[PDB]
Amino acid sequence: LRIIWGTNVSIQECTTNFRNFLMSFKYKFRKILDERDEELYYIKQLNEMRELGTSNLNLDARNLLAYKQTEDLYHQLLNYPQEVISIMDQTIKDCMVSLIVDNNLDYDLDEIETKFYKVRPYNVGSCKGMRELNPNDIDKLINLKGLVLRSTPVIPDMKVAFFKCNVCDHTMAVEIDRGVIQEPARCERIDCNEPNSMSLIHNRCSFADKQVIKLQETPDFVPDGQTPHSISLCVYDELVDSCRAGDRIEVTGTFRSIPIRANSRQRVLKSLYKTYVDVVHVK
Amino acid sequence: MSAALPSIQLPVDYNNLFNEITDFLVTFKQDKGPKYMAMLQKVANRELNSVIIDLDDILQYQNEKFLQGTQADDLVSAIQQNANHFTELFCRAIDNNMPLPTKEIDYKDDVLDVILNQRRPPNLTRRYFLYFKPLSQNCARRYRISSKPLSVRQIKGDFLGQLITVRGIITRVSDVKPAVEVIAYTCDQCGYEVFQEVNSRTFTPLSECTSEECSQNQTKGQLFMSTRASKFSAFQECKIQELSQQVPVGHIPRSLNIHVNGTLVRSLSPGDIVDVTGIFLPAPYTGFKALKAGLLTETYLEAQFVRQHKKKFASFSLTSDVEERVMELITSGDVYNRLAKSIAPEIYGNLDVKKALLLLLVGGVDKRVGDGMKIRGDINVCLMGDPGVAKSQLLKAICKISPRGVYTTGKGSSGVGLTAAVMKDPVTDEMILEGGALVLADNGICCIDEFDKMDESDRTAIHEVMEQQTISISKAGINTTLNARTSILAAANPLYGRYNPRLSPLDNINLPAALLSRFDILFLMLDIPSRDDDEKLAEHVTYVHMHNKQPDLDFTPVEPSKMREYIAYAKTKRPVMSEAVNDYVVQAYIRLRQDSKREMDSKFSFGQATPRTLLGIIRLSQALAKLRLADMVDIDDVEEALRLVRVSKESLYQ
């Protein structure tokens, strides 16, 4: 048995189930959902995508709802989208390499191993604007439909915390841990022992790409006395220059929360957490 | 130091308080099994998110103790005070004894119970909020109070924290948002959690490792926080403003603030009569650091239960008795004209106009094309006519009885008071919008007077509203297509006060037919003397002024509560129309069209019947079918519709 603390998700079991569903799905929804030729709905995308070198893939929810052995995967990708998708990023490459076993190919293997993979669940269960999101249901895969008003500039973020030792002609490298950087004050005791002699340079480091989009919510039902609202969200790299003013949109993401500082002076925060949304896909 | 913090004692005895509370939690059987324990079983089933507290049941158990010769140990007399401390004692008592889950935990349920069982202060182990509700004095009178409806000004100061019930009107409430109650700090190295508790507005995070294992450790590996383990609960604030009739002479009312959390955040909406209940508690603010003498406190209140005399349309579910009310209402017969009669009996006659108001209230039937369009089941009426006759009693009664009602003047703040506004919210930085008089009305009713005196801006807005249920604005940050879904009911007077019998209505009236075409109905209420009718007109007026009791007919007009119950029940249906009535409607439409066009282009002629006239006839026939409570339309209704349509202007020929 393998499990995550405070969770009911298995890595290898989910991988095997995902591989089985991937190998076995042929317009099952046309049969089960309704009465409505082809074969192996999913497998064509994966067969074709390899030669074009793309690290992206889309995914529906009705297909999992239809296949016999994905109903439980439904609620597990629902409640824990990021964790389930991190599992899938490995399961997809596992299936990719287990499917190349039945093929002889020119030597393109230099890329797939170094590659990455990510998914985009787009057509998912409906959500009733933001009024439904009382704090019971935070941090979950969500959908919406609205238009665009305002777009912000690019927010860099510390991704590779370079560091410059003042002496001994030595650099230093350290990475981020859950969104903070702990500068090692020491100076590589072996060569030199100065407990707090190091510097910071920005040009060396690596940066992430983030945006913020003001959105107008356009629901299908409203209570007695409703009025328009505005929300903020966050998209990340490889999605920049995608959505802007003048486009109606149906979107997917993950409702979240965060506190804000009381000033630019000290660390005292608000008892109330400003809400936001982190994107997963845009239709 | 006994000088500072010296000893003192009071009759309070938490030892027996807890015993009494816990015995009550389990002895309840007078109103499954012990329904309190049954609701606890439901909570174990994850059915509800907030326990309910009945207080007259506590009174009844005290009565039981009194009858059995036991020391009743009355705790309500103290619970009315200091409820902020008793909340955490009642929660502890409940947590002490929680029944076991009769059902099993699965992958399809709340995602919190799984963690609760995984790890199976005490606050984070609490899966149930609490929200009190005070007694209704009708039963406190039985056997023999503490909280009556009070005002924004009659606080008296000493009522900080006691049990109170304040009425008024809610002006603006911010959107619901989360607020922490317990922090979840996990250690990187020790692997053990930490519980940092915050109850003020702000705090300071715990960064350095004071973990219990780190205490016996040279190294102090840093800790961090969690986004799911840490507790949370909503927090939303509202403002009351005092009711009009209770304001003293020439006194300007003042405001007040309340705080809300968790479940009951959804039971508040601006513009409704309310009876808030809770406790009035202080907060840390002392003016602003120059006009201060120390110890000053800004204040607020606690929200625990909401009851409002105005029941919106969405609260309709039948029961064992309200259907009986409807049954005895419909048994009498003549229900339609009886309603038209009971609509504002303070004024005389005009049963046709009262009926038109009734059909305005009904609204019609909603239909969807499904091709990217729908159509309104909505009505729009006007009561053009000269002064002297009653004009405003109708609108005032409509606003009194109908919910989601609104009243406005003709001139004044019509520039933006009938339109969207821009404002920053107090409790959180945000550009929230609160609309004008129309927007505060939705799926409800609106009233207007002296329409001729309003601005062309108001005319343009109402022109768009009447036919289409949106609103368009291109002034500022607001670039919305706001949904109105409102029913308009205006009124005005001719250019010369009294009617001009030698001029047509199309010239005597000041409004243009380019807009009035949307007005599906229109009455011309003008007065000419007559020796006999004014006899009993004066009789009626003199009697009603002698005493408010309307004429003593063998008839009892009924309360607007029952009227709103009936209208809500009738709004549930969606009848259908047959071809036998459709063909007659088409024939009547052709008749009226040709007759009015060819003949009525003369003295007493107003424009011409229109497709909107046909649509209004259809909607009103649908309303008649709804009132009869049948899913089909009879031929016996279009006759009534057209009779009223052509009788609206009978007086124009005398």
Ligand SMILES: Nc1ncnc2c1ncn2[C@@H]1O[C@H](COP(=O)(O)OP(=O)(O)O)[C@@H](O)[C@H]1O
């Ligand atoms: N049929 C009636 N019975 C009793 N009182 C009436 C009647 N018609 C008019 N009145 C009185 O005359 C006044 C006229 O005011 P109203 O018609 O409401 O507004 P306006 O002054 O704009 O016409 C009212 O205050 C009302 O009390």
Ligand SMILES: [Zn+2]
């Ligand atoms: Zn060095």
Ligand SMILES: [Zn+2]
């Ligand atoms: Zn520690």
